[PDB]
């Protein structure tokens, strides 16, 4: 369908210079996505084989921002993403043809990187799902395509028990996705300066130090819900005094139950 030609991840986004407080994890999952392609000879010459990937799970929070970092900071050619919602569809059995055509396009792209999104939509009879994941681990364990290929499993619920017991073979680094900090959000706002026309009267420090418990999704609702709440009245200028109720309401009315 349209997801085949639309599967390419064009239109780069959040870069590395605007990371959301990630200090150690950004290296733990960066040294496998950015450095192995920059220095392939060190991994093949120094030891057994280059690392494959890491594991990301837990609360959503600032999810998909680090994958946006991988898309933006790509050196030569942006990689291809894979979502889980394209597998569970009508006329079951198409998952084998889909994984064979994305493996065919992956080998057409000299064995580039593959990003798996929402593995819990198909994980958790699932014999065709076992065919997809066992064809993934089976066709990817072979050194024939490449050794620098990287997978990335992102999920919200750890209820995928079968992938959790099949992952220790190839995958590793079972760690939480990312914890949010307090000082890094001003860079998410600095890259949100390329968003819609925020009036220059707003100060990023005043909007930054007046909102605790401001995880990446919640500040995404600060800029997103702030802008759209400024489109409620279809206004033209967006001053912080106009949507301050949207700010303290989007942090407090949402911080009531959570």
């Amino acid at each position: 369908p349209t997801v085949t030609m639309m599967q390419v991840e064009e239109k780069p986004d959040v870069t590395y210079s605007d990371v959301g407080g990630c200090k150690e994890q950004i290296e733990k999952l960066r040294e496998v996505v950015e450095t192995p392609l920059l220095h392939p000879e060190r991994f093949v010459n120094l030891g057994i084989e280059p690392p494959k990937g890491v594991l990301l799970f837990g609360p959503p929070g600032t999810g998909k921002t680090l994958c946006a970092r991988a898309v933006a900071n790509r050196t030569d050619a942006c990689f291809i993403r894979v979502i889980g919602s394209e597998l569970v569809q009508k006329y079951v059995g198409e998952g084998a043809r889909m994984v064979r055509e994305l493996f065919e396009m992956a080998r057409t792209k000299k064995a580039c990187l593959i990003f798996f999104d929402e593995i819990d939509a198909i994980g958790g009879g699932d014999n065709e799902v076992q065919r997809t994941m066992l064809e993934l681990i089976n066709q990817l364990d072979g050194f024939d395509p490449r050794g620098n290929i990287k997978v990335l499993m992102a999920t919200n619920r750890p209820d995928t028990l079968d992938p959790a017991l099949m992952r220790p073979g190839r995958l590793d680094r079972k760690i939480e996705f990312s914890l949010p900090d307090l000082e890094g959000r001003t860079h998410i706002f600095k890259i949100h300066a390329r968003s819609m026309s925020v009036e220059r009267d707003i100060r990023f420090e005043l909007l930054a130090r007046l909102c605790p418990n401001s995880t990446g999704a919640e500040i995404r609702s600060v800029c997103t819900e702030a802008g759209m709440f400024a489109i409620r009245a279809r206004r033209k200028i967006a001053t912080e005094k106009d949507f301050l109720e949207a700010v303290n309401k989007v942090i407090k009315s949402y911080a009531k139950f959570s």
């Binding site: 569809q89 009508k90 026309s197 489109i231 409620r232 009245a233 279809r234 033209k236 200028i237």
Partner: protein, 227 residues
């Protein structure tokens, strides 16, 4: 009647595109989401009267309910993609969806409505057309439709049942209130416009506008017995 603030607020809401071009192209708002409405009374004429302001100077498109999907095999979102491509070739238009009651009349509705949710957000298309969704009960929608779908603004239309009926009924008697503010359970603009239009034409028929309580309960009994 009486809902002037909500109709001027939704008027300024739906009158940003195609009007006032000196700031719409210089500021750069261009929201590719539209608004989402609903109403416990519904009846299509209240929400159609709230979104009817787009029909002044524009091209209107109306798709009421998913009945054309459930009456066929599992084709799914292909017709939605046909409306997306014809809406891309017909950008100066308004996508109006009304009476979303697929469950008020099951697993497929969640996946074709999830695909309609993802494709409706505009992941592969920038600001091209406005999408307006409308239903009757907000509790019938799945919680997945909250973050992607409802991002701009939702309206909270109250059902007084004892204030708007007294206002409109007072407008009718201006030319025995508990019987019609208690007996009636749904009103809209097509009722006052209907019985006032045929009341004016009837006043052209018999050349007098005198309204008696028995003739008004007979004309009410016509609509009550009609349904």
């Amino acid at each position: 009647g009486g809902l002037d603030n909500q109709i001027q607020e939704i008027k300024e809401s739906v009158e940003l595109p195609l009007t006032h071009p000196e700031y719409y192209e210089e500021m750069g708002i261009k929201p590719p989401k539209g608004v989402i409405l609903y109403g416990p009374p519904g009846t299509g004429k209240t929400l159609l009267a709230k979104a009817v302001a787009n029909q002044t100077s524009a091209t209107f498109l109306r798709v009421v309910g998913s009945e054309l999907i459930q009456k066929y095999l599992g084709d799914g979102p292909k017709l939605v993609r046909e409306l997306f491509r014809v809406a891309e070739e017909h950008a100066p238009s308004i996508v109006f969806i009304d009476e979303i009651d697929a469950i008020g009349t099951e697993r497929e509705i969640q996946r074709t409505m999830l695909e309609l949710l993802n494709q409706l957000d505009g992941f592969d298309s920038r600001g091209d057309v406005k999408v307006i969704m409308a239903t009757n009960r907000i509790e019938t929608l799945d919680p997945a439709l909250i973050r992607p779908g409802r991002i701009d603004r939702k309206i909270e239309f109250p059902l007084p049942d004892e204030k708007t009926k007294k206002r409109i009924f007072q407008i009718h008697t201006s030319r025995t209130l508990d019987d019609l503010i208690m007996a009636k359970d749904d009103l809209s603009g097509a009722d006052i416009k209907a019985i006032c239009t045929e009341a004016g034409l009837m006043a052209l028929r018999e050349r007098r506008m005198k309204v008696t309580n028995e003739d008004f309960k007979k004309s009410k009994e016509n609509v009550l017995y009609k349904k």
